[PDB]
Design a protein around this ligand. Structure first.
Ligand SMILES: *[C@@H]1O[C@H](CO[C@@H]2O[C@@H](C)[C@@H](O)[C@@H](O)[C@@H]2O)[C@@H](O[C@@H]2O[C@H](CO)[C@@H](O[C@@H]3O[C@H](CO)[C@@H](O)[C@H](O)[C@@H]3O)[C@H](O)[C@H]2NC(C)=O)[C@H](O)[C@H]1NC(C)=O
Ligand code: CL
Ligand code: ZN
Length: 586
């Protein structure tokens, strides 16, 4: 009966709020204070939520969902029939949760040490090395050391994790875990769609890749860069070569049009991690969107503690499922890169606040890509030279083609370069999940995709025992990654649409939507839907059409593509890496 399904949904929602809230705090306390005590409590609360999940998951499966007239109820019940890990027998559930905590703890406490003295952590020490050093050998020491410590130490857990996560998924009706993760998008054509989208950005990526390779050749020398081969993975200013903006100094198109040192500028003017979130909070309120509650400031962890405390440093945002308590945990460093991250995270918080009146089951993004896109959309405006100048972090750069092409390169090194990395991660994991990649081939298959999609090679040949994917946070933390790919495509579709709505004319990359209430309304109406409707409804609301599309991104960067083509031709570059077998001779 319809009414029995309505009662169940009401019961599931009341008890989920309480249970999910207690979990959230336990998980929070461990994430911000890694100890044995908090570790134990989190594992105990894991069993409690699993017990709530099992109970309602079992009730949910006694209902025939496609014989139910109300769609919103049909949609809630369907979700609740997926128990995720709670489908496992008791022994396996216990092993799975322990393994996840073991992998996460291992990642977060790993250090890379000189035998003489100092021991470095990932954030901020090794990060800062990858961002600032221009010495091949020092970059190499950090890149390899990180992988020797975090990557190799995760390898012992992974096959068993894969086994249990797949068991869970099969018991919830999926064929494996990758299958289950793709289902979150409710888009049967997903793989084809993502591939089409990846192919559309190849012109821009291969041209970017060749130009950066050239500038690397210039700086690190011809004996260490093959201009027809892949780039060594440790020279791009980032530990995973996922964003390249930190080597802007090596690739600046017009050196005669220099930019202010934004890090120097923020420090000299007394910017704190707290001021960086206040400024993002102001952007959101300028659009007519909600302010973060007072509680957010009292309880969030906006910097790395100076306290001895071991914490999980990866930037993230938290919903406690009472509709009032939302938090960010970030090891914020005072620089431009983390100003963008602050906006990204504050986007999560705004999404939480926007859908807080929905049933808890529908309290997530239209799809996971939408959740990651909101902050980034505002950050695109914040990032414009015009806006940064109004924050006094750049001097005037307007009305000069040289600064304009420089800005677009700066943006391209983060936005375009992340397209292939973000695509690659779950191509590898999906194939791990479906058994196409065994633990004999974890690493080799990782590097085949690194080569194929990104055009990177490892600077040091990989040995038996390496598990480089373990050195990226999301692998051991078991966080799906394709969302960031979707995110980078659609945030530009959102930018374009919001700019149109705000009355901006002229090139898209000059748009700044600060204070546009018309832009605000669109985001707000879409965010309010939560997971209540299929994601094309939200896309439609924001952009006036229902597809994912690379058009907005190609239009944003079109002036850069013309400039890269002319430049690369002028120097006779081969686009791609035809000599794909090349690795550093050294
Ligand atoms: C299918 O059912 C959904 C879900 O609504 C509800 O869930 C059930 C389990 C029961 O608890 C119901 O009592 C409960 O309504 C219906 O969605 C709901 O529709 C109503 C009617 O418009 C919405 O009411 C609005 O509430 C806001 C307050 O924020 C007011 O400002 C509006 O003026 C209006 O009163 C309600 O918000 C909405 N909720 C959700 C989650 O969708 C839906 O109408 C129904 N569909 C059909 C075809 O019957
Ligand atoms: Cl790697
Ligand atoms: Zn995010």
């Amino acid at each position: 009966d319809e009414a029995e399904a309505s009662k169940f949904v009401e019961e599931y929602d009341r008890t989920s709020q309480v249970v999910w809230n207690e979990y959230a705090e336990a998980n929070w306390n461990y994430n911000t204070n890694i100890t044995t005590e908090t570790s134990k409590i989190l594992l105990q609360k894991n069993m409690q939520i699993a017990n709530h999940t099992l109970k309602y998951g079992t009730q949910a499966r006694k209902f025939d969902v496609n014989q139910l007239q109300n769609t919103t109820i049909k949609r809630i019940i369907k979700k609740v029939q997926d128990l995720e890990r709670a489908a496992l027998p008791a022994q396996e559930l216990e092993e799975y949760n322990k393994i996840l905590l073991d992998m996460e703890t291992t990642y977060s406490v790993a250090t890379v040490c000189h035998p003489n003295g100092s021991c470095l952590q990932l954030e901020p020490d090794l990060t800062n090395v990858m961002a600032t050093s221009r010495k091949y050998e020092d970059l190499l020491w950090a890149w390899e050391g990180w992988r020797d410590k975090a990557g190799r130490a995760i390898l012992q857990f992974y096959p068993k994790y894969v086994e249990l996560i797949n068991q869970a998924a099969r018991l919830n009706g999926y064929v494996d875990a990758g299958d289950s993760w793709r289902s979150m998008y409710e888009t049967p054509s997903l793989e084809q769609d993502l591939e089409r989208l990846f192919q559309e950005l190849q012109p821009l990526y291969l041209n970017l890749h060749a130009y950066v390779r050239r500038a690397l050749h210039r700086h690190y020398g011809a004996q260490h860069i093959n201009l027809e081969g892949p780039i060594p993975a440790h020279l791009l200013g980032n530990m995973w070569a996922q964003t390249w903006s930190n080597i802007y100094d090596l690739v600046v198109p017009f050196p005669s049009a220099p930019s202010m040192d934004t890090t120097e500028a923020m420090l000299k003017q007394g910017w704190t991690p707290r001021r960086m979130f206040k400024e993002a909070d102001d952007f959101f309120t300028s659009l007519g969107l909600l302010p973060v509650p007072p509680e957010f400031w009292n309880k969030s962890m906006l910097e790395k503690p100076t306290d001895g405390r071991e914490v999980v440093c990866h930037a993230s945002a938290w919903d406690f499922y009472n509709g009032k308590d939302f938090r960010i945990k970030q090891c914020t460093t005072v620089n431009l890169e983390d100003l963008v991250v602050a906006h990204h995270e504050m986007g999560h918080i705004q999404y939480f606040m926007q859908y807080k009146d929905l049933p808890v089951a529908l309290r997530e993004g239209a799809n996971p890509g939408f959740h990651e896109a909101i902050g980034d959309v505002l950050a695109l405006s914040v990032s414009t030279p015009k806006h940064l100048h109004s924050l006094n972090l750049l001097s005037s750069e307007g009305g000069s083609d040289e600064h304009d092409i420089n800005f677009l390169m700066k943006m391209a090194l983060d936005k375009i370069a992340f397209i292939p990395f973000s695509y690659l991660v779950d191509q590898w994991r999906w194939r791990v999940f479906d058994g196409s990649i065994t633990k004999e081939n974890y690493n080799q298959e990782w590097w085949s995709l690194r080569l194929k999609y990104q055009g990177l090679c490892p600077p040091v040949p990989r040995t038996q025992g390496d598990f480089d994917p373990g050195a990226k946070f999301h692998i051991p933390s078991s966080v799906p990654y394709i969302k960031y790919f979707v995110s980078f495509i659609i945030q530009f579709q959102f930018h374009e649409a919001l700019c149109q709505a705000a009355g901006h004319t002229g090139p898209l990359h000059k748009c700044d939507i600060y204070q546009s209430k018309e832009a605000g309304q669109r985001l707000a109406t879409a965010m309010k839907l939560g997971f209540s409707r299929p994601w094309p409804e939200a896309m439609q609301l924001i952009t006036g059409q229902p597809n994912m599309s690379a058009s907005a991104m190609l239009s944003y960067f079109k002036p850069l593509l013309d400039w890269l083509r002319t430049e690369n031709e002028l120097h006779g570059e081969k686009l791609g890496w035809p000599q794909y077998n090349w690795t550093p001779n050294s």
